[PDB]
Amino acid sequence: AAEFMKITILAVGKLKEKYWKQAIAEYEKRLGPYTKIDIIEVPDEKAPENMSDKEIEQVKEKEGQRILAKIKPQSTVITLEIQGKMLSSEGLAQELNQRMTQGQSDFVFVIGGSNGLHKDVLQRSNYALSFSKMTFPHQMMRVVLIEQVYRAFKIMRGEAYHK
Amino acid sequence: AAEFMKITILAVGKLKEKYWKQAIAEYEKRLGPYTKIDIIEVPDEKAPENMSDKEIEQVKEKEGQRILAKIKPQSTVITLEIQGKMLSSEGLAQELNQRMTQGQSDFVFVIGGSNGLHKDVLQRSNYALSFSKMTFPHQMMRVVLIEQVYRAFKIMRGEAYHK
Ligand SMILES: C[S@@+](CC[C@H](N)C(=O)[O-])C[C@H]1O[C@@H](n2cnc3c(N)ncnc32)[C@H](O)[C@@H]1O
Ligand SMILES: C[S@@+](CC[C@H](N)C(=O)[O-])C[C@H]1O[C@@H](n2cnc3c(N)ncnc32)[C@H](O)[C@@H]1O
């Protein structure tokens, strides 16, 4: 218990709108006293409309190589996958708290680019996490995720906010 | 087919952050050419932390009376409920398109305040829609919803955006 948790949001591409940036800064600020959190962005390939199957795969492969070069073998990797496992807000806090009680302290949340994640990234994942059956765009998704991490930490500390 | 669809987002409370306001204005602008959309806000009760069961109920009842006074008997009411039915993005477009083909053109999406929705509002609902098992705060939820309505209309028109 001599260590605070470490949360990394590892995402593909930069945010393009000032309002998403402002939302993320506010949740980073709110999460500051509870965990070290940092956001790491890696280059996104250009994503035209209707590319071939081949081209989609190559985009995911290039982005995947960048994502994997930023991940250490000992980190607990949680990949955001539409078709991953669904958890309630109390369920996400339970899963992180359980892993923390088990000694895990370095969590890396991974967000794919517009075409999703390469099989090698999905294979390295220690937990596939779905936020919904719906498809969220990657910029907004980053905000939704950090707000939910904020929520999970309030629940874990048993502090008011989740109504 | 002499009419465009009408989308109303009926929510409790005003937005407090300029960045959520900016996000909503951008999606309203993008949706403009495809549907009439408008956002109607009704007063939110104060929501302290840990109120009694009784007090929570009374908050939902007051907000519910305001919400129901803005709803017409012929509108198709879709209530956002964490425990409602889950749909994928293609599923939400299918449900709206199906209803439109059946003659429905006035859709009212309802977002509760921090404590959720009163039973009378939930009873008037023609469809309980869940966006996730997780709990989203009401301000962010409004953004997530309008982005998804934007997405459903692009899918329904068979126009690129959903990758
Ligand atoms: C536009 S989405 C991916 C669409 C792609 N067709 C797929 O099937 O993954 C971009 C990234 O955002 C994240 N994301 C979007 N919606 C999500 C959801 N409902 N649950 C978990 N992650 C989601 C995922 O990490 C995804 O790689
Ligand atoms: C903080 S939430 C409600 C929490 C309350 N304990 C409940 O059980 O409804 C405020 C409003 O946002 C909307 N909302 C939040 N998360 C949602 C989700 N995952 N799916 C559908 N609606 C949601 C709902 O309309 C809800 O009334």
UniProtKB/Swiss-Prot annotation, chains A, B:
One GO cellular component, as annotated: cytoplasm
Family the UniProt entry places it in: Belongs to the RNA methyltransferase RlmH family.
Database matches in HAMAP family: 23SrRNA_methyltr_H
Entry-linked Pfam families: SPOUT_MTase
Annotated GO MF terms: rRNA (pseudouridine-N3-)-methyltransferase activity
Compartments (UniProt record): Cytoplasm
Quaternary structure and interacting proteins, as annotated: Homodimer.
Record's keyword annotation contains Phosphoprotein: no
Record-listed S-adenosyl-L-methionine binding positions: 80, 112, 131-136
Effect of residue 81 to A: 30% decrease in methyltransferase activity
Protein name, UniProt field: Ribosomal RNA large subunit methyltransferase H
CDD domains referenced in this protein's UniProt entry, alphabetically: RlmH-like (cd18081)
Role noted for this protein: Specifically methylates the pseudouridine at position 1915 (m3Psi1915) in 23S rRNA. Specific for fully assembled 70S ribosomes.
